[PDB]
From a paper:
The product template (PT) domains act as an aldol cyclase to control the regiospecific aldol cyclization of the extremely reactive poly-β-ketone intermediate assembled by an iterative type I polyketide synthases (PKSs). We describe here the structural and computational characterization of a bacteria PT domain that controls C2–C7 cyclization in orsellinic acid (OSA) synthesis. Here, we confirm that [name] PT domain functions as an aldol cyclase to catalyze C2–C7 cyclization in OSA synthesis by comparing the products generated by [name] and its mutants. Crystal structure of the bacterial PT domain closely resembles dehydrase (DH) domains of modular type I PKSs in the overall fold, dimerization interface and His-Asp catalytic dyad organization, but is significantly different from PTs of fungal iterative type I PKSs.
The protein crystallized in space group P21 with two independent monomers per asymmetric unit. The structure was solved to 2.0-Å resolution through selenomethionine incorporation and SAD phasing. Each monomer comprises a DHD fold of DH domains, characterized by a continuous antiparallel β-sheet curving around two α-helices (αHD1 from the N-terminal and αHD2 from the C-terminal hotdog folds). The C-terminal hotdog (residues 1056-1174) possesses an additional helix (αC) comparted to the N-terminal hotdog (residues 915-1032). These two hotdogs are connected by a 23-residue-long flexible linker containing two short helices (αL1 and αL2). The two monomers in the asymmetric unit dimerize through N-terminal β strands and bury a surface area of 665 Å2 (calculated by PDBe PISA). The dimer interface of [name] PT is dominated by hydrophobic interactions and hydrogen bonds. However, the two monomers of [name] PT are obviously in a different relative orientation, forming an angle of ~150o. The H949 is from the cap loop of the N-terminal hotdog and the D1104 from the helix αHD2 of the C-terminal hotdog. The Nδ of H949 forms a hydrogen bond with the backbone carbonyl oxygen of I956, suggesting that Nε may be used as a basic nitrogen to deprotonate the substrate. The D1104 is 5 Å from the H949 and the D1104A mutant shows a slightly decreased production of OSA, indicating that the D1104 of [name] PT may be involved in catalysis indirectly.
Author numbering:
A (entry chain A): 915 to 1174
B (entry chain B): 915 to 945, 951 to 1054, 1070 to 1174
Amino acid sequence: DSHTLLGTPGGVAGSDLRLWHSTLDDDSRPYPGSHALNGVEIVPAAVLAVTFLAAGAEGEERRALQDMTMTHPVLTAGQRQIQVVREGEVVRLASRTVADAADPNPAWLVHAEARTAAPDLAGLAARSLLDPGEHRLEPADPGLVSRRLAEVGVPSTGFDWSVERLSAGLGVLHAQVLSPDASSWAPLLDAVMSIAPAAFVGLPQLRMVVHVDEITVDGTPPEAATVEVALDPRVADTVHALVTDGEGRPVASLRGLRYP
Amino acid sequence: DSHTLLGTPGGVAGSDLRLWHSTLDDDSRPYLNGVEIVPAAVLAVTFLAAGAEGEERRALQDMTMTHPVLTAGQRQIQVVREGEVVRLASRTVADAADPNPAWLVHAEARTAAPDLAGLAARSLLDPGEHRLEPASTGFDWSVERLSAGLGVLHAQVLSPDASSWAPLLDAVMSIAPAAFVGLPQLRMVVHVDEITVDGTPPEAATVEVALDPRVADTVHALVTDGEGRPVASLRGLRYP
């Protein structure tokens, strides 16, 4: 209910390794809603992100994430054991079949990994939203926003956010987002990563994020935000995001979201 | 090896760390009044086995025994192999109300490639040269014969259980403090520089124990079969 997959802390004697263990099934999903491909429930990338943020910052101040790879999706179907590992500046999320007498130590599958780093908050604060006029952002019809947002991502969302306004240009979107749950960054991160693939031009494809070069968050999540999402002009299948609060102060950035 | 504290293997994703977990209880001993103490020999064979999970056999070096493994009821045991370092720890049995009690590290050692040609080149000190006059047991071993000199003993030991090295190692580490001159004190080993074992334990053995002439509170041991072929050595047993 923290929106993370961090369960019971575990230690290795004589080692600064940090572990957390948990069991995942359909009745212990750390998020409220459903995130599913035709009845295939997949843990949202936002949950992986906040899990890594929490694991990074446990005995310390908050971290940014770098080179977050999401190689294999985490499914909720049946029952699986989850291990989150912090080893130095590396965090990993793994799962395996629930151990039993016949297989008391099944091998781990590593789903995702990132590196933790000191957040670049002056970098973050020096960002601002692209100028609407300069990039010719036209306000979009609510009905088409809903259809587009549905088309490019998984039909329902994991979390309680919504788009109250959206302006769109060529490979740029500005979305005014409501996010009443401020108990974690997962809802806003889920909004960013659900809205981001709407920026791609051409025919709508269903995409899922598999990599992020950098995730930086600052402070507690606001309940109203503007989410900017912009195509990388040079590298395919890549989007960059900025989140500001209602007064336009930058509160999160996600660089190099990859949606192949 | 039947006398180790190695329980269920466990792993850390993305790491070559090896873990084993077990619960230690008076009902299921792998080998005072209401308190139980794990013999040093059990710690040694645990570390030998943890060292040699992939490989065939390791020697141990710099085995330190800091806190005895004591139990009056139930305790969780963790054995850790991290590269060439092995550690043994214990804690109160976790539950939902206390889900991650802290580990107490009892002992540690380093693993290394056993020097078996070195071991085979050892032999028992000459009885005549050292003027040997012929004169706890939680396991099944016993001393059937003993010759003693100044700071040296040769003890013929019977050890019917050959399912592990723990009984013979326990005999060595129990008989070694007898090598100290002067009035008998109870001593218990807290450090060993090197432990090397080869093959399966014999059921009859001779144990040599000799004071280090130069360093205080230190004893060296050699274990041979009945024909004097070396099967184990323990160098630098420290008994403060």
